[model samples]
Target chain A: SFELPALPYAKDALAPHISAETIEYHYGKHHQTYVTNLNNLIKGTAFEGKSLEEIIRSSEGGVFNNAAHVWNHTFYWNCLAPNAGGEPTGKVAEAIAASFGSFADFKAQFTDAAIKNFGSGWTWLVKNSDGKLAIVSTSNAGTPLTTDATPLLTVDVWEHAYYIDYRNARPGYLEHFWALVNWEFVAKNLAA
Target chain B: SFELPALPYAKDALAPHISAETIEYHYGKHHQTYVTNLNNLIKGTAFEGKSLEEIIRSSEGGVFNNAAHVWNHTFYWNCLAPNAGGEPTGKVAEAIAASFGSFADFKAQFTDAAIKNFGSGWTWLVKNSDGKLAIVSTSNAGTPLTTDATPLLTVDVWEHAYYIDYRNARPGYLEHFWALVNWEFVAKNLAA
Candidate 1:
């Protein structure tokens, strides 16, 4: 039985970067629905009691869509912090530098990927099979779990993530997103 | 030379069903950006001076994305009426009856299509190559323009289209959408 996780941070904590109302609807409503729907969907199936990543890998159609969204939304919450964002440190930092030349260059490429992602989706920083750092974008309900990549960080580009605060200014939302990265959580994902 | 057409009705016109606030962002910003981007993208290119439908048919990549959205959004706006929705009463009615058996069945099928459309897209009632009416859903700026089908009516299912008013309740948004549909516009499209 999958459940909706409480947000890692207070709804208002992200503040000017992402408003309280946005979080309320995003986490409170959108993410909650994924959990609710997924639970109901897998009720009598073999998917019952399976882990989210397991469901994502094993399911298709409505099952996969709801399950993956449940996992993605949880990960997305940990990707933000009140005083987060900026350069990385530790092995993740070394990997990023080795792969992308510099943190500035890495930010540029990630920003470009997020900006150019044509529709509702997510932009991810992942550790590939070759152990190289790379950026990827996935369309709705997509996740790196289905691939060999290990997602270190992700930015939800779905309109529900930003429309309340930024309206239609996706670039503006992205700019604020840059200033709110939970590097600690990202480093933890890298370690895992 | 593509331009953003002013929404045919006042922003507040579709209240309760679709809030004015939702219209402000969906039309005033989202739709406007598609028009602006199409114009800027086509500058000094062969796509310049071509009609939106022509561009949709002939272009690919970014040009196609923007052009098709411009065309689709325009059609989407004309599909709604302040006090609309119920059943069609014209040749369109005959066509619906012929194609889907009855209005209730058509509504059920159309609703199912809109609900099942994953991620960002539009759900359309289109006239197909056989001159029969059918329900279609297109993902992320996709349009019937690229196919042999002629779009008669559309309901924008992108999060930005309903997030403010309906949150995660796409079904609720769709229900109200049924009530707000401009059958007159649909009848005219059938005539054309």
Candidate 2:
């Protein structure tokens, strides 16, 4: 009974940064396809009623891929907003500074990781069990849920995420992604 | 000494099916970037002056990823022609029939592999040590060079390959790709 979640913002909300067409296909087609596949895969199985995170934690191969993409795309939508982005504030800012020397250094490091991910994947700013922030990248349907680190924020580097708007210039897409990131969501995830 | 080879056909040779824009970016940007990265990576290293195929066989990580992509993409371009696709002729035809039962069966198997290749990778028609034809898929810059199989032809399943042309409809791209495939190239590879 898994379902694709509605995007946090309207499809065109992040346009100019990410086009409405990119969102429609990335969300409407790519993300929904994962949900559809996950629902069909886990049906009539021991995983039938399991949560997406639960399924991600326990499965491998296709089941893991589809379930994790469903979860990741859901999180990805919330990580973006129409007029968001800038320096973090409150505890999140303090945590980033404490772990990464300064906010500028942290942004530089995260941007580099996203740019160099080299294939379909995500780059994340995560808080480990010790409450220290770090950057991690995972390939192709991989997520931070598999590790001890709790994902605070993420940027998807998959081609389907930005190809229409940026073509093969991933660095260009990453540059604009910073301007569209939802800082509030990062802070909320940190508190959670 | 590694160089990016020019496309075997015009940039728009596969137009209407694959499109000129996709070729320009995929070949001009993505493929050339891999060649440049490979060149830089091996500039002062043991891999310098090595053949592209040799570099692929002997390298790992960034070096392997770039080198193998250069080789794979070179092969991929030659696998197509302006007006191609249909059953193979001569030795490759007999090999496909021997290994896959019939040409229709071979097409089904190859198409299935291309459609189900889960991540950023390729689906290949390869020749085994026993001279049998088989369908294989590899993920994220992986090439058939690492294995005993000899790749004869490939269909790139990477999102960047078809995202602009078909969005999330990989199947649509694959359907068109079959029409653009150069079966004559398969016969050439089989002879070699």
C-alpha DockQ of every model: 0.75, 0.84
> How badly does each model clash, as a count of residue pairs?
0, 0
| Residue A26 lDDT (model 2) | 88
| Tens-digit lDDT track of model 1 for B1-192 | 877998889999999899998888888888898999999999999988788888899999999999999888899899997988888887888999999999999999999999889999999899998998889999999998888998898999998898888877899999999989999999998888
Model 2 is docked with a DockQ of 0.84
Model 2: per-residue Cα lDDT over A1-192, one tens digit each = 998888888889998999999988889888989999988898999999999989999999899999999999899899999878877788988999999999999999999999989878999999999989999999988999999999989999989898999999889999889889898999999999
Model 2 over residues B1-192: C-alpha lDDT tens digits? 767887898888897879999998999999999999998989999999788888888889899999989888888888888888866678777888899899899888888988888879999989998878789999988988899998888998899888878988899998889888898887788788
Point out the worst 10-residue segment of candidate 1 chain A by lDDT. Answer: A84-93
For model 1, the stretches where C-alpha displacement exceeds 4 angstroms are none
| Best prediction by TM-score | 2
Taking every candidate in turn, the Cα RMSD to the unseen true structure, in Å, is 1.7, 1.0
